[PDB]
Amino acid sequence: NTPEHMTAVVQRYVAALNAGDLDGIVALFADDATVEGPVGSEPRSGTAAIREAYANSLKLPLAVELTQEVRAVANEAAFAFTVSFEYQGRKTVVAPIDHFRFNGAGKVVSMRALFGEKNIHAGA
Amino acid sequence: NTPEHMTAVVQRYVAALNAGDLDGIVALFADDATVEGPVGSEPRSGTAAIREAYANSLKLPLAVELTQEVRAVANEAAFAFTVSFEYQGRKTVVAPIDHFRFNGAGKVVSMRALFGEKNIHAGA
Numbered sequence: 001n002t003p004e005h006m007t008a009v010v011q012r013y014v015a016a017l018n019a020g021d022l023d024g025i026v027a028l029f030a031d032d033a034t035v036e037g038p039v040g041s042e043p044r045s046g047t048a049a050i051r052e053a054y055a056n057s058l059k060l061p062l063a064v065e066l067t068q069e070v071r072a073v074a075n076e077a078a079f080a081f082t083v084s085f086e087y088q089g090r091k092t093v094v095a096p097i098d099h100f101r102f103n104g105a106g107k108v109v110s111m112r113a114l115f116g117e118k119n120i121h122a123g124a
Numbered sequence: 125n126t127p128e129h130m131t132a133v134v135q136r137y138v139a140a141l142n143a144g145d146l147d148g149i150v151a152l153f154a155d156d157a158t159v160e161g162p163v164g165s166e167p168r169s170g171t172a173a174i175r176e177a178y179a180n181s182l183k184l185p186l187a188v189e190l191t192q193e194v195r196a197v198a199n200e201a202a203f204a205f206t207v208s209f210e211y212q213g214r215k216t217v218v219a220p221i222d223h224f225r226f227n228g229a230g231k232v233v234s235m236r237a238l239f240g241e242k243n244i245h246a247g248a
């Protein structure tokens with residue numbers, strides 16, 4: 001469980017969101033992992049709940065892009081990125097910072113997505 | 125304790141590091157706050173320990189800059205930035221992502237600085 005590996009996992013995650021690859025996303029998580037997004041809302045725990053959450057997230061085609069280098073140290077990674085989508089002619093860009101914590105096996109045991117209304121950038 | 129306030133606190137923090145303003149930094153924290161930087165190392169707790177930690181951080185003049193919008197939601201903020209300094213003719217730029225959690229009073233109760241060796245950018 002190295003910085004190289006954690007950075008790679010972040011890149012796999014971004015790419016799988018772009019591809020709508022739900023298996024690929026869920027495969028990154030430990031069986032008892034938790035996901036909390038946005039920070040503040042009630043977390044989802046376990047493979048089944050995690051899959052359901054990302055299924056709802058992938059209803060629309062997402063364009064996802066890392067916007068800076070990944071920060072990876074010890075057993076944690078943080079990264080800045082954008083998620084862009086379009087609905088009823090409005091394009092929206094959401095710019096979160098995510099935090100992953102990894103277990104010794106290199107699977108994500110916790111994901112937290114930090115973004116507020118000021119990080120949601122959309123026209124009329 | 126609003127996103128506006130948390131964003132302002134982040135901006136006050138960045139500016140106080142630039143100014144070497146140790147009082148200004150410590151004033152942002154709750155009396156029993158913790159600081160952990162880099163993530164992984166042993167955290168420091170309490171006003172006295174927090175001041176000592178930032179005193180050591182301010183031995184050299186720091187140039188600190190937010191490099192993206194702050195992410196602020198509920199009681200937490202995350203931000204991407206750089207800390208630049210020079211020593212013995214070598215310029216170094218460190219690019220962390222910090223996470224703050226706030227108490228109801230609007231003081232920082234926990235700070236975590238996430239950066240690894242790949243986020244330390246220095247010449248020979």
Ligand SMILES: C[C@]12CCc3c(ccc4cc(O)ccc34)[C@@H]1CCC2=O
Nearest residue numbers: 037057058083084085094096098113
């Ligand atoms: C962008 C988004 C809010 C956050 C978000 C979405 C999808 C995948 C995400 C993946 C993340 O790691 C962090 C945040 C999101 C939603 C899809 C529609 C929407 O409003």
Ligand SMILES: C[C@]12CCc3c(ccc4cc(O)ccc34)[C@@H]1CCC2=O
Nearest residue numbers: 161181182207208209218220222237
């Ligand atoms: C940049 C640095 C490592 C991280 C760091 C420093 C100083 C203030 C910081 C403030 C932060 O919120 C996060 C990280 C740092 C150090 C000064 C010298 C050095 O190597």
